[PDB]
Design a protein around this ligand. Structure first.
Ligand SMILES: Nc1ncnc2c1ncn2[C@@H]1O[C@H](COP(=O)(O)O)[C@@H](O)[C@H]1O
Ligand SMILES: Nc1ncnc2c1ncn2[C@@H]1O[C@H](COP(=O)(O)O)[C@@H](O)[C@H]1O
Ligand SMILES: CCCCCCCCCCCCC/C=C\[C@H](O)[C@H](N)CO
Ligand SMILES: CCCCCCCCCCCCC/C=C\[C@H](O)[C@H](N)CO
Ligand SMILES: [Cl-]
Ligand SMILES: [K+]
Ligand SMILES: [K+]
Ligand SMILES: [K+]
Ligand code: NA
Ligand code: NA
Lengths: 48, 97, 297, 245, 245, 297, 49
């Protein structure tokens, strides 16, 4: 969860709204196991 | 790192790009909530936009720490302090800061 | 750095589990030593105090005059692998033609071995078990007949798409493991590793899988251990048209490389439901046979 | 010199002059989780004396007709003292326990209680009596809290297993002509290094009369059974707000 | 490289890119109580990470006319988290604190806050105005809890002493053109080795605007001041039931 | 024993207070060194950042061209003992004949030195103070006359019986210390040790002496520190009949062997009550003199 | 903006304990991920078609 600790403050002349972009990844202690098929199958009918 | 669609709400083709970023703006100083999302990387939701989430889908089990890096794209003259929290299992969605 | 004495001298953090007992090799039954009469005060092997919680330490030698016996009787058949590494039935799957259940030519079986009492009672002697397994699939028609029919078995782990028809795209099986075999071939057989996210499977879990209020409607979740839920076993006749024959697939499991912990009382009432110890309250029977009087055979 | 004992831990001390030794479950003492068995990465909190101490939680009356009772651990303590608070504020918990069940009478009373610890004590229901209804026990029966719960069918431990074989678990007996208490030390038992103190009860404590209480008219008829227990080597991790369930 | 900082303690981390160094009160870091200074004999509990962490307790709005506020320690925390629980269950407590006051604006706003720590901050009253009535401040003014309390007469710190000399105490300034936070580390200060977290506040935290907040119409007018603090080296003793006062 | 790494490497328990500063001997004021012009970039002594919380480090030498000055001015008179070891008035006790207050020939004074502003303002510069003291008692009639009258002064610690009359049995003084002296003798004088149950007396205590609800009626107890309450000083004319003369006893205190901690802002509003910092809200005055304009003297 | 992923680790963001991680990385090798037979073609040979 993300909260305002203080406030977004800006002087006269600058936009009152701005955006944040989030980038995610795994740390070096991350591993996966038990190989399986993905939940999605990207085709509806036969692919021609 | 790949882009996490925290803002996974718009669905019309013309607004899909808006899912890639979320906003902040001047508030009332009441420690207001900006956004929330589950941290489960292989669950439906924001993480599906990430390569990690997709690769995760080919494995039944996973283990490890995750990291989310937030980049502020407002103007140079904008300042602010945000509190980002991670609530371990069992804790319901925090009602306040 | 630590400077106050109570901190220096504390045992907070000792990770070594102090053990009061240790295993000894015992490949054969113990021998008997010669003994003679003992007419003594102070020494009293026969007298015990069961309240302590331990079993009697009295032996043959101290209760009667014994001879010497060199016992070479082996203890090998009572090892966990000896007791458990024997294939038993753990699942039956029907694939009928004209049917109420699976008339569509495929079937999904949630992997749970608690549907058959012989196997179940044996594994429930322990609380936690860790092992590898060999699965064998015996297929035939309901009369025990063998027909020239090709089948596909697929292992679908939690999260993989379960097939919903004989023609599901999921049968492409690009990542899940599948076995293609004919009914005319010998039974298919494969090895399976220990797959739980936990260090062991546990036949008993006194708890709930999630947090929250545990209201009457979510009471069916008491005892549900996702760590034991390995997925689904799917089978289908391999074709775009319905099979000409009704089939039955019987699944046998043989455990190997077994480890077990925390023995418990063995089931003495009939089982009623899978993974749940409910018993019929109106038909509570004694554990064994009964007689008319305690002074009569 | 085996009949007499003192158990001191934290700011609490227990004495007994009619003991029957001490049982250490499965032959091993409680210990903290090793760096190789552990998996969670946050530094744990080990409150020590404020939580590893004796808590006296309940008293039951032993009657000539009592069926027996059970308590679930760590459930009995989740709402008591500093231990409870820690169990509520943290996702992860782990600990051992020293259990001391008390019951004294007179050299003229008689009876014997079986005191045992059963790991993963899953409760079953009578399935609608006929065995056709797949019912489940309610939260108050699975996690009865400090009050414990009375057994409906002791012979099958309300779980379809024979109480006659419960002695395969760590246990002691309180046989009135012999002793007035039972002491059992239990290490942390689970297939995971840490777990939730709220969602999972690692074991159950059973106190069941096997030889009924008896005495002549005129002898004190109120014979209480009191339960005192102490967590040992408590460790907590995964801190957030307090949660009761 | 003095303007940038990271404070990590427990499961909490604070960052700032407009800092002004760090003040260590009276030149010394918090430490645990030595075996020679101590007097109580029970083994203390030192919960560590579960209580020595950052707690964000309150946000005030800085207005062009604000007079200033104060908070009392450890009062602000007696009802929060695992620290609070420990403070309630134990008679004795002792700890240091890392205080981090936050306030950012823009390169076009201006103003300066004095952030200071005053040990034994006894509050006085205006004595009925005329000075003939020997009145006393109410509990809510002496121990205001997390909300803090607004100064009635900042010039005399509501205690008959000059705020002009408050800089003789550990302090920093938040001068908007320069920094956006103040960080002060405070050791345990008292004439006793341990004391009651409930009956005695060891010091008060004062945040007072000395150069008024100002900006032109159109610039963000809501300028919050947030208070975050972390106990350090917390120790508790004299365990019994929980008490709130 | 400790085995998990976080326990081994932890600093929990470090009793050594890490100190960033240390005292240096400074018996005289610092000297001035010769300096010359500096025309440099990078070096900027004059510029400071008061926000940090520290005082300026700039010195004479770096702001102007200085000569060498050997400063032998002593710092001895500004030590705590120099400042405080001077006797000042801390109490006055009246023993009138025909009176409203003490017409019974004895008086009890609760030891509290905050009744006189000169002494009070000085000690309140610090939060905690530890010291020994020399008490001197100057007695005479209200006109400053000396009469041939014998008095008894008794120190009554908390818990000892306070006398309730000129003839109280408590004056037997078998254990408390008493001084018998004539008004004609020089002032009585004694040494007193540091008596608090605490390591120091504290002029400020932000708290309550007891637990409980702190309702309006028990608000007069806010700030009451029993650790500062040393007892009662009792005085009586030594006789079974009323004295022929009205008396006044003035008490002077001279601190010695002083230690002080935590300096604080000095009182700038008139005092109103003993041990309580109340001030008159309607008469809040500036700390000092004022002028008409900032550009004028 | 630099284009690199964050270098921050658990150890520097919270107080951590020591954990000896023996979890294997073997199943995520290219051969592990790809060496599993999947359907890539279907060919029909009907009679009347
Ligand atoms: N519980 C047991 N079951 C079977 N054989 C045993 C057992 N304990 C000891 N032995 C055998 O007896 C010998 C040890 O005798 P002792 O030294 O008196 O314990 C060994 O060589 C073992 O083969
Ligand atoms: N704060 C001070 N007040 C008075 N004299 C000082 C002070 N600091 C240093 N000195 C004197 O200056 C000498 C040390 O100079 P320095 O080594 O540059 O600190 C000593 O011999 C002291 O007598
Ligand atoms: C190609 C087909 C392969 C078939 C794959 C079989 C995988 C079976 C894994 C063994 C799992 C052991 C049993 C585990 C749990 C119990 O049955 C119940 N869930 C207990 O609640
Ligand atoms: C034979 C007579 C001897 C007289 C004995 C005098 C004892 C005086 C002890 C010095 C005490 C120092 C002052 C202590 C506290 C302050 O006055 C106030 N209580 C502050 O609230
Ligand atoms: Cl997930
Ligand atoms: K043998
Ligand atoms: K000098
Ligand atoms: K490793
Ligand atoms: Na014996
Ligand atoms: Na400078």
């Amino acid at each position: 969860s993300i909260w305002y600790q203080t406030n977004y403050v800006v002087p006269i002349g600058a936009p009152n709204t701005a955006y944040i972009i989030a980038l995610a990844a795994a740390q070096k202690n991350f591993t996966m196991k038990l190989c399986k098929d993905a939940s999605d199958i990207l085709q509806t009918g036969t692919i021609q | 790192e790949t882009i996490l669609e925290v803002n996974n709400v718009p669905t019309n083709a013309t607004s899909l790009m808006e899912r890639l970023r979320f906003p902040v703006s001047a508030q009332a100083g009441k420690g207001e909530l900006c956004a929330v999302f589950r941290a489960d990387p292989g669950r439906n939701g924001p993480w599906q936009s990430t390569l990690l989430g997709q690769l995760c889908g080919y494995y039944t089990q996973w283990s490890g720490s995750l990291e989310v890096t937030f980049m502020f794209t407002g103007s140079f003259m904008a300042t602010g302090k945000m509190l980002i929290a991670y609530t371990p299992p069992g804790g319901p969605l925090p009602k306040d800061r | 750095g630590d400077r106050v004495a109570d901190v220096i001298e504390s045992s907070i953090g000792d990770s070594v589990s102090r053990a009061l007992t240790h295993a000894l090799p015992a490949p054969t039954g113990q021998n008997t030593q010669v003994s003679s009469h003992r007419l003594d005060t102070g020494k009293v092997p026969a007298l015990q105090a069961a309240e302590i919680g331990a079993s009697s330490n009295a032996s043959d030698e101290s209760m009667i005059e014994t001879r010497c016996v060199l016992n070479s009787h082996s203890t090998a058949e009572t090892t966990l692998d000896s007791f458990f590494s024997r294939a038993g039935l753990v699942g039956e799957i029907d694939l009928p033609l004209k049917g109420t259940t699976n008339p569509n030519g495929y079937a999904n079986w949630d992997i749970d071995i608690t549907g058959y009492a012989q196997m179940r009672r044996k594994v429930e002697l322990f609380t936690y078990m860790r092992f590898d397994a060999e699965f064998t699939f015996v297929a035939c028609t309901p009369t025990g007949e063998v027909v020239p029919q090709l089948l596909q078995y697929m292992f679908v782990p939690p999260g993989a798409p379960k097939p919903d028809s004989r023609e599901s795209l999921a049968w492409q099986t690009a990542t899940n493991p599948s076995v293609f075999v004919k009914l005319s071939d010998p039974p298919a057989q494969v090895s399976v590793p220990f797959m739980s996210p936990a260090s062991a499977y546990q036949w008993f879990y006194d708890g709930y899988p999630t947090f929250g209020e545990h209201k009457q409607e979510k009471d069916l979740e008491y005892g549900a251990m996702p760590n034991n839920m390995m997925g689904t076993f799917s089978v289908r006749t391999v074709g775009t048209s319905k099979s000409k024959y009704p089939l039955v697939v019987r699944i046998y499991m043989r455990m190997k490389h077994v480890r077990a912990w925390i023995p418990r009382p063995m089931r003495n009432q009939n089982y009623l439901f899978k993974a749940n110890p409910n018993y019929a309250g109106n038909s509570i029977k004694p554990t064994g046979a009964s007689r008319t009087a305690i002074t009569t055979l | 010199s085996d009949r007499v004992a003192q158990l001191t831990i934290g700011n609490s001390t227990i004495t007994t002059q009619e003991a029957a030794n001490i049982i250490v479950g499965y032959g091993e003492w409680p210990s903290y989780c090793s760096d190789s068995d552990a998996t969670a990465v946050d530094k744990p909190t080990r409150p020590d004396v404020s939580v590893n101490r004796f808590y006296t939680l309940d008293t039951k009356l032993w009657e000539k007709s009592s069926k027996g009772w059970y308590w679930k651990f760590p459930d009995v303590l989740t709402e008591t003292g500093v231990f409870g608070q820690n169990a509520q504020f943290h996702y992860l918990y782990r600990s051992g326990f020293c259990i001391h069940v008390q019951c004294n009478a007179s050299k003229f009373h008689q009876g014997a209680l079986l005191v045992a610890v059963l790991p993963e004590y899953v409760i079953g229901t009578v399935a609608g009596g006929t065995g056709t209804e797949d019912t489940h026990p309610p939260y108050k029966q699975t996690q009865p809290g400090a009050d414990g719960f009375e057994l409906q069918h002791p012979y099958v431990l309300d779980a379809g297993i024979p109480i006659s074989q419960l002695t395969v678990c760590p246990h002691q007996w309180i046989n009135l002509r012999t002793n007035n208490c039972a002491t059992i030390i239990v290490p942390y038992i689970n297939a995971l290094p840490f777990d939730s103190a709220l969602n999972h009860c690692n074991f159950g404590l059973l106190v069941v009369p096997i030889s009924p209480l008896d005495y002549d008219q005129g002898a004190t008829p109120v014979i209480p059974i009191t339960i005192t227990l102490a967590p040992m080597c408590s460790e907590f991790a995964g801190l957030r707000q307090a949660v009761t369930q």
